[PDB]
Amino acid sequence: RDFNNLTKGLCTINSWHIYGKDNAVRIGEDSDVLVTREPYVSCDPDECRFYALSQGTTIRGKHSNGTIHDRSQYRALISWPLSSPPTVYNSRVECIGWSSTSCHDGKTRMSICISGPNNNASAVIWYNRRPVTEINTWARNILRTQESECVCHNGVCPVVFTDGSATGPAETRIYYFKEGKILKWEPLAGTAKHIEECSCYGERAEITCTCKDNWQGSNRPVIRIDPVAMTHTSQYICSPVLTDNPRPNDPTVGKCNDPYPGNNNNGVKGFSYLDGVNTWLGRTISIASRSGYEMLKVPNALTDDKSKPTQGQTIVLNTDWSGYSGSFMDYWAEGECYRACFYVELIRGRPKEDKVWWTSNSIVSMCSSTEFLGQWDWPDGAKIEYFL
Amino acid sequence: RDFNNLTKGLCTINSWHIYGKDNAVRIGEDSDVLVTREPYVSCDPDECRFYALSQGTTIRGKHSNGTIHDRSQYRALISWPLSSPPTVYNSRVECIGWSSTSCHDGKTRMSICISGPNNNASAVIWYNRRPVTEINTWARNILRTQESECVCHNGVCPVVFTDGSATGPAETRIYYFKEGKILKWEPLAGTAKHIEECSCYGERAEITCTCKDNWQGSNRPVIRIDPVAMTHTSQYICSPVLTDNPRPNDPTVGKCNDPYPGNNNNGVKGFSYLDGVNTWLGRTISIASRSGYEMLKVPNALTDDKSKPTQGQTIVLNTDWSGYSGSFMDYWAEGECYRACFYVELIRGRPKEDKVWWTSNSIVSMCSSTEFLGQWDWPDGAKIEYFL
Amino acid sequence: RDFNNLTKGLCTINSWHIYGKDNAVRIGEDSDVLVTREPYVSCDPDECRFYALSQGTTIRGKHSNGTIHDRSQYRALISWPLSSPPTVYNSRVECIGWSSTSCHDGKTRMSICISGPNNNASAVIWYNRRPVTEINTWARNILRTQESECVCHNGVCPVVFTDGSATGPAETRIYYFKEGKILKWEPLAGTAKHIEECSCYGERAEITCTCKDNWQGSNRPVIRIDPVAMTHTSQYICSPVLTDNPRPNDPTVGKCNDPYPGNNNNGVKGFSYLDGVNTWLGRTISIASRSGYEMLKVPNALTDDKSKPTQGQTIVLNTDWSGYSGSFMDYWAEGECYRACFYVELIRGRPKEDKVWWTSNSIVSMCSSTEFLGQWDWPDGAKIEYFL
Amino acid sequence: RDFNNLTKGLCTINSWHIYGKDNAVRIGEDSDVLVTREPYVSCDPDECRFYALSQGTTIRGKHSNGTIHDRSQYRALISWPLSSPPTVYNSRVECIGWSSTSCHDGKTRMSICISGPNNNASAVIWYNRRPVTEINTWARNILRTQESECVCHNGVCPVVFTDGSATGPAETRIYYFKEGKILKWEPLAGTAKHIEECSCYGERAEITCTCKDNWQGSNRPVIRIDPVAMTHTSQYICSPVLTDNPRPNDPTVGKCNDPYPGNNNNGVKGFSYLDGVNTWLGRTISIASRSGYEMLKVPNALTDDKSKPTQGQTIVLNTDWSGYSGSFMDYWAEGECYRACFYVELIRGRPKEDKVWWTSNSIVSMCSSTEFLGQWDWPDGAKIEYFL
Ligand SMILES: *[C@@H]1O[C@H](CO)[C@@H](O[C@@H]2O[C@H](CO)[C@@H](O[C@@H]3O[C@H](CO[C@H]4O[C@H](CO)[C@@H](O)[C@H](O)[C@@H]4O)[C@@H](O)[C@H](O[C@H]4O[C@H](CO)[C@@H](O)[C@H](O)[C@@H]4O[C@H]4O[C@H](CO)[C@@H](O)[C@H](O)[C@@H]4O[C@H]4O[C@H](CO)[C@@H](O)[C@H](O)[C@@H]4O)[C@@H]3O)[C@H](O)[C@H]2NC(C)=O)[C@H](O)[C@H]1NC(C)=O
Ligand SMILES: *[C@@H]1O[C@H](CO)[C@@H](O[C@@H]2O[C@H](CO)[C@@H](O[C@@H]3O[C@H](CO[C@H]4O[C@H](CO)[C@@H](O)[C@H](O)[C@@H]4O)[C@@H](O)[C@H](O[C@H]4O[C@H](CO)[C@@H](O)[C@H](O)[C@@H]4O[C@H]4O[C@H](CO)[C@@H](O)[C@H](O)[C@@H]4O[C@H]4O[C@H](CO)[C@@H](O)[C@H](O)[C@@H]4O)[C@@H]3O)[C@H](O)[C@H]2NC(C)=O)[C@H](O)[C@H]1NC(C)=O
Ligand SMILES: *[C@@H]1O[C@H](CO)[C@@H](O[C@@H]2O[C@H](CO)[C@@H](O[C@@H]3O[C@H](CO[C@H]4O[C@H](CO)[C@@H](O)[C@H](O)[C@@H]4O)[C@@H](O)[C@H](O[C@H]4O[C@H](CO)[C@@H](O)[C@H](O)[C@@H]4O[C@H]4O[C@H](CO)[C@@H](O)[C@H](O)[C@@H]4O[C@H]4O[C@H](CO)[C@@H](O)[C@H](O)[C@@H]4O)[C@@H]3O)[C@H](O)[C@H]2NC(C)=O)[C@H](O)[C@H]1NC(C)=O
Ligand SMILES: *[C@@H]1O[C@H](CO)[C@@H](O[C@@H]2O[C@H](CO)[C@@H](O[C@@H]3O[C@H](CO[C@H]4O[C@H](CO)[C@@H](O)[C@H](O)[C@@H]4O)[C@@H](O)[C@H](O[C@H]4O[C@H](CO)[C@@H](O)[C@H](O)[C@@H]4O[C@H]4O[C@H](CO)[C@@H](O)[C@H](O)[C@@H]4O[C@H]4O[C@H](CO)[C@@H](O)[C@H](O)[C@@H]4O)[C@@H]3O)[C@H](O)[C@H]2NC(C)=O)[C@H](O)[C@H]1NC(C)=O
Ligand SMILES: *[C@@H]1O[C@H](CO)[C@@H](O[C@@H]2O[C@H](CO)[C@@H](O)[C@H](O)[C@H]2NC(C)=O)[C@H](O)[C@H]1NC(C)=O
Ligand SMILES: *[C@@H]1O[C@H](CO)[C@@H](O[C@@H]2O[C@H](CO)[C@@H](O)[C@H](O)[C@H]2NC(C)=O)[C@H](O)[C@H]1NC(C)=O
Ligand SMILES: CCC(CC)[C@H](NC(C)=O)[C@@H]1[C@H](O)[C@@H](C(=O)O)C[C@H]1NC(=N)N
Ligand SMILES: CCC(CC)[C@H](NC(C)=O)[C@@H]1[C@H](O)[C@@H](C(=O)O)C[C@H]1NC(=N)N
Ligand SMILES: CCC(CC)[C@H](NC(C)=O)[C@@H]1[C@H](O)[C@@H](C(=O)O)C[C@H]1NC(=N)N
Ligand SMILES: CCC(CC)[C@H](NC(C)=O)[C@@H]1[C@H](O)[C@@H](C(=O)O)C[C@H]1NC(=N)N
Ligand SMILES: [Ca+2]
Ligand SMILES: [Ca+2]
Ligand SMILES: [Ca+2]
Ligand SMILES: [Ca+2]
Ligand SMILES: [Ca+2]
Ligand SMILES: [Ca+2]
Numbered sequence A, B, C, D: 001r002d003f004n005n006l007t008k009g010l011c012t013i014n015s016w017h018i019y020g021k022d023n024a025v026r027i028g029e030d031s032d033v034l035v036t037r038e039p040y041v042s043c044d045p046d047e048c049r050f051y052a053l054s055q056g057t058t059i060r061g062k063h064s065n066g067t068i069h070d071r072s073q074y075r076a077l078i079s080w081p082l083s084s085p086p087t088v089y090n091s092r093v094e095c096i097g098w099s100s101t102s103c104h105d106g107k108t109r110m111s112i113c114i115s116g117p118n119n120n121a122s123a124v125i126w127y128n129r130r131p132v133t134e135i136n137t138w139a140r141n142i143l144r145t146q147e148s149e150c151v152c153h154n155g156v157c158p159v160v161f162t163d164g165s166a167t168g169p170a171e172t173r174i175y176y177f178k179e180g181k182i183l184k185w186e187p188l189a190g191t192a193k194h195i196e197e198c199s200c201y202g203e204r205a206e207i208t209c210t211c212k213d214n215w216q217g218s219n220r221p222v223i224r225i226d227p228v229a230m231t232h233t234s235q236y237i238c239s240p241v242l243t244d245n246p247r248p249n250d251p252t253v254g255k256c257n258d259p260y261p262g263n264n265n266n267g268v269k270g271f272s273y274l275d276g277v278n279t280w281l282g283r284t285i286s287i288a289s290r291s292g293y294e295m296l297k298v299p300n301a302l303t304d305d306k307s308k309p310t311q312g313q314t315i316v317l318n319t320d321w322s323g324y325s326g327s328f329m330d331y332w333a334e335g336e337c338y339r340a341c342f343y344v345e346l347i348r349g350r351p352k353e354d355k356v357w358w359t360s361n362s363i364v365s366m367c368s369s370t371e372f373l374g375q376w377d378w379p380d381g382a383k384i385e386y387f388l
């Protein structure tokens, strides 16, 4: 009943344990499972749930045809019980739109959905399941946001938005909301040259967001926000362990204040936990496509431009499809530290599997362990041939 | 735990933002979605839900054949979570019947359902999910009511009913209920000549209802109710911007105290927000059929017989089917004013799409913003060819 | 939180209004609706629900074949929200068995299910959703009970059971339970010669049960129970308006203390409200089969052997199938009197409709009004041809 | 709100009454029922639920093919309302994995799921629906646990795990958890030579577990745990009434401190209630396959190596398939004693019914009665031919 404060630091990450997995595409082959994409996980004080952008049709439905498309009037942010699949009957609509973010401040939840045509989109900010504030596009070119949870501190929940070209300079803004109202907003500052789809987490009154430089960088831009002062900084992960996709092969020295070149106008949402020697980066295994997923322990990745891995864990084999990935934590758990968690979107269907006419995904999610646990791989598990 | 009082005025409407959309016909192509019509939205102090008259069959079910019919023994008022579709498994039956209204008074909900043959229908008034009062037909010709939410003030919830011919003078009554009991009723007074399907909202201890003159008027009749004195007045929207359907082309001067002629014996349920310069009217785009939907800002529409639009917003393109529309507000929201909202029923199937043997709909709903937001169009989205 | 006491009398019954209807067979043609039979309605202090004996299969399922059978290991007492259909996903299992009763005492619910082979059945009495007491068959011939709600007074909930032949003298017992424990039991006394499937209601600290004399009577046996003294009496409804089925044509004088002859070894569960001039009897319209349903006002039917109808209401046309019927009331409603209610089981399938291989039903239920309301008829509504 | 203490003794078992049955395979022939195996039952202070390991697909789904397999990435521990079937829409995922246990301590529930490849599995211990502790494999050979509920006393919930060969000596550990944290662990001691899948219950501050000696014994190993001292003992049921499967014919003298020989490297999870003369053993009827199920009253079975049955009850006929069986009790029921309960997994499909490509099960469960109740048999009830 009081706003949550980010008073703890991250727990020591020595490995990752399975947290949730919905097997949605497998189950949806013969049950009323909604087509989704851009999933994430977010916790309330008494429950943690899966979230995603529905496409407003089931996977077996005839309206699944054409669901590779990103922005239609039939999309909505939905949430559903942890590890169940997103069904027609258990999915709760949080708001209507084709780009979203959502977070609980300790008292209630803020959810944000953006909708509209490319040149006239608008964000609606919901708080306590009611619409409170609206924001019109400022650059008239696909106003858009995180696609994973936001983070709050003493009621202030910063959110990163981008409006403008995805393949050149754009207008990124950091909005500071409280009870769904705008306290302040600032234009992006720092050395990040382009920002998309930030994945954020909080610890010791600081919010760290790992984003995607769609324009030029194969290294990831990082925004660090002070939610009390309502100010931020930006840079890139200095490490040569490159974590966007597609991307060039890893070098031996990265770039701290500029995009690491080699691949232009493409990328995938991803994340990292940046905490000195307790630093872990996620990335696709393939440098060319959204296939495979691994976690690499890269001490001081944010600030050391020669930092390389000292430990790792395979999450998804390179022979299995992956997709977006993002961070979340259960800020209401017991204990002295916050346990880092992440999800990986396992994309099925188009464009990589074009024998089917749809595009959907399932979710797998892990949280850190202080033990050094054995590893397994966690594929989507569905057989495309069954849907033919 | 206290009855709600209409103490606030309307927020300034500068545009409309998306509030909810269930994509029911799209989803129902491959899931157990009930056939409905005559939908609406209504809020409780802790939740807002979609409501509609079920036809007692799913859309893919063989019993969907013949659902163009208005009044069968298989209909019921159902409610379901905001923006989910009306499924067999998540729909809550409020009462049995083929005409309804429902509203929360701040303590609990009153729901009214009318059933019976044309010459012997009766209304049952439920309060706190129990039947409390019954009213027999008084004119023996399809006793019927709003098809959208009623409004309460200090426990008094006025409801408009009509019994008698739909194409000549009829017997309209305004009932004032409190805890599901009849405090008083009055025959319609004022200059409205015929009343059907009123759409109501409340602000500053006054309830305004925009209804449909099925007999002669293409302008809409308006009933204004004082819920404390339990008295009312009636007139027509004076504006030349005609909002029924079908309707003749717009003139330059309307009629305040008589039906605007040109079209007889037909009409569609609709609504308006009448608040001086903050006045917005909804209407179908087509003058001939239930196609398209737009909101027009028409300053002083109620009292100015030459008032024309000063701003507008397209909700549904004229190349997409629309249908009934009505008003509702979240009277339990935070803030200093009541935010105007509306829904549009998107009718699919018969009679306009007769390759299918059913008639159903989906819902789209918006609420006002004080920003001037970009506009999008919101069609039902289902492909009729898939149901063949 | 206190046990309910039967302190009120019945409201004056001047007509019947629609209360609930699930349209289960119609909806179940294309959705996962369980096959049932022997339904009823029962209220808790905060909700009223539909109850029935599942057959442990959906209607469209291949295991629906053979569901005319009464007693299998796949049956269970289930409950579900008022007017929704009994689906796989919303049905709550109360206990396992093929004969049941259930009632709320004001604090929590007692549910009783009987299971077993014909010569070795046993009743399990559940209280607060936990098994508390068990009763073994005493006559080794289909131990069985009401098939509709029981009634409680100050925690004492009497229940009528029968064990022994259905076509000759049997051993009927009245058990008085409190918190699921046996306080006392008594053998049937009075002039009723055979008792089956009692339908009960309570008012002014007396419980009245209208049962079925399967052996010889076409008039119905009546048991009146004093739940404080834990004693009872039995007789038959004296009226010549005969209410079992099948039955001979109505005479002009009935029998008070013996079975009215003409039909042997058959019958249907039914009910009545016996309250002086406020007396209403339900019955099938047909004298030969379970078809049609009507309510007849028969002043002093219990004690006047020449009493005939003074008013009536058709519930189901004689061209539509009916079935079991029973009484229930919402003992937790507001107001000064208890409103009489009843349900009618609308049986579909075998044996009357043998083109399908299943037997199921839907439910329709009404409650009394003090108004003289217009009447409608309420058929099941499903088209058997669709299931072929 | 206080930890539960095992202060009561067992009620006198004079017979068994039906408690729950989900008919999952029958219902799942035409509804969205998940494929499962390794089910169990466990109670919270306010509800009792069915639990099982999902296979992450429905039974009618094409992904049901291959579900004989024990350990995939698509398995999860799920729970669902007592006697309903495990559907896609009502099943709650407790954790991800292919081996589990779960128990309520009076304050909240602890659930444990093991996942991973055979040589690198790990257990995750959840408490209050959040991950708290992780345990890595210690013998690198299928770390695994009970497959039925654990038992708590004053917050201490002992759990038995095994890691290592299933057909030779292995490394069994007894972990003592409290609030999901490890208080202590001990290696197995006593004369049991191999332990698998323990079935446990508690009474008078002692926890008794009946397990399976997969390696050499056809008699069952028994572990008795003192949850206060956090110590244990082990032996075998001395009785000649052999209760594993497959097994040799019963001798006249059993073995107390060594495996009863005749069958190697196979077995089925089972259980017993060991309480002096109030001792009842469950077993398959067949000595060769998982067919039939019976309860036998065998006074002093644990300590008397010549003890034979004095009473019995058939649960499942030998012409019907059975499977795993385990113990649970409602520790929060009213009364002076704990009522012994058990479930039997009714396995359908492979390997015994190989015309279908799946393996699943339904559940039947009973609790003891102090009456001597008539017996019935409770088969799964589904017709395999319908799934072809
Ligand atoms: C039971 O489970 C346990 C626990 O999971 C298992 O133990 C785990 O085993 C893992 C696999 O060996 C291991 O993970 C590796 O950790 C390495 C770090 O450790 C080593 O180095 C440190 C530092 O010197 C030592 O202290 C330590 O002792 C070790 O020697 C990582 O380096 C590994 O990652 C690299 O390899 C994999 C391929 O295996 C790549 O996918 C990965 O991206 C890394 O390599 C690429 O990137 C680097 C960095 O730029 C390049 O230098 C390199 O050339 C590669 O680049 C190519 O590939 C990438 C990706 O495609 C591409 O972008 C690029 O352009 C190039 O083409 C790996 O993470 C766990 O740490 C270990 N855990 C523990 C606790 O022990 C155990 O095996 C299991 N048991 C059984 C029996 O199965
Ligand atoms: C990004 O989004 C923003 C925000 O949504 C977009 O900006 C919006 O743009 C809208 C479209 O232009 C605009 O809506 C129009 O507003 C007009 C009022 O503004 C004009 O007049 C006022 C008053 O003088 C000026 O102050 C102002 O500056 C403007 O000049 C309305 O008049 C418009 O409605 C009329 O036109 C549409 C067709 O476009 C009809 O559907 C509608 O019914 C109205 O016209 C009929 O009715 C009138 C009244 O009787 C008749 O006079 C007229 O002849 C028409 O009658 C025929 O048609 C009807 C209907 O079929 C029939 O019944 C009748 O019989 C006749 O056959 C319209 O509402 C928004 O206000 C504007 N918002 C803002 C904040 O700017 C922006 O464009 C987007 N950007 C991009 C790049 O897309
Ligand atoms: C709008 O709705 C309103 C309200 O519903 C409608 O008004 C209702 O109209 C109903 C139909 O007319 C009416 O119900 C009838 O009531 C009769 C009692 O009223 C009459 O008698 C009293 C006493 O003298 C007068 O005071 C009063 O003014 C009336 O004259 C009942 O007697 C009626 O039931 C009998 O008829 C029906 C057939 O219509 C049978 O189904 C029924 O079982 C009864 O008859 C059988 O049983 C009796 C008793 O033994 C026998 O004597 C008789 O021969 C019949 O027996 C055969 O049939 C049975 C059944 O199959 C079989 O077992 C037996 O062996 C024999 O074969 C009937 O109940 C409502 O009371 C009335 N309500 C009000 C408030 O007015 C209005 O019409 C609607 N408007 C429109 C325009 O539709
Ligand atoms: C109404 O319901 C009531 C209540 O349920 C019914 O009454 C019940 O009737 C049951 C069936 O008769 C009965 O159960 C039997 O109880 C026997 C114990 O009672 C007898 O012995 C005691 C001790 O002397 C006496 O005091 C008592 O009066 C009785 O005489 C058990 O011994 C029975 O189990 C044995 O038989 C069944 C076959 O019927 C086997 O399945 C079972 O495993 C037992 O036999 C095997 O095991 C023993 C022990 O090692 C061997 O000695 C024996 O040779 C068998 O071994 C072969 O088979 C096993 C299993 O396949 C295999 O592993 C082995 O290698 C060998 O091949 C049985 O449990 C209930 O107690 C009784 N209840 C009451 C309260 O009365 C009533 O009948 C019903 N009414 C109607 C009309 O139906
Ligand atoms: C709506 O207005 C009525 C007064 O007109 C308020 O009613 C009073 O409420 C208080 C609190 O329960 C009582 O002590 C009075 O007896 C109430 N009755 C009247 C008629 O005076 C009501 O509280 C107002 N609602 C809200 C939400 O404030
Ligand atoms: C189970 O036994 C323990 C005592 O061994 C009880 O614990 C005490 O409970 C009271 C009430 O909360 C506290 O004041 C004590 O501090 C508790 N702790 C101990 C270890 O003493 C517990 O209440 C018992 N459970 C029930 C349901 O009675
Ligand atoms: C055109 C801008 C893109 C972000 C860099 C685009 N975002 C939106 C709001 O459309 C994403 C991108 O095209 C898709 C992907 O790369 O997987 C997802 C897609 N995201 C969503 N549909 N929500
Ligand atoms: C005959 C009277 C009509 C109202 C003016 C009629 N109302 C009823 C209760 O039947 C409506 C009208 O026929 C249909 C429509 O125009 O869309 C809906 C239909 N409304 C409903 N079925 N609830
Ligand atoms: C053989 C005894 C009958 C009661 C007089 C019989 N009751 C039971 C428990 O089987 C009923 C009768 O055969 C069926 C009917 O007449 O509709 C229902 C059937 N009732 C149930 N299946 N619950
Ligand atoms: C290889 C070890 C076996 C236990 C002795 C094995 N356990 C696991 C975790 O795989 C079980 C056994 O193979 C199957 C059975 O006998 O029915 C179930 C299977 N149990 C599970 N799948 N959970
Ligand atoms: Ca470089
Ligand atoms: Ca990039
Ligand atoms: Ca004019
Ligand atoms: Ca009109
Ligand atoms: Ca289906
Ligand atoms: Ca006679």
Ligand SMILES: [Ca+2]
Residues within 6 Å of the ligand: C212, C213, C214, C215, C216, C217, C218, C244, C245, C263, C265, C266, C267, C268
């Ligand atoms: Ca009879």
Ligand SMILES: [Ca+2]
Residues within 6 Å of the ligand: D251, D252, D253, D254
């Ligand atoms: Ca021996």
Ligand SMILES: [Ca+2]
Residues within 6 Å of the ligand: D212, D213, D214, D215, D216, D217, D218, D244, D245, D263, D265, D266, D267, D268
């Ligand atoms: Ca063995």
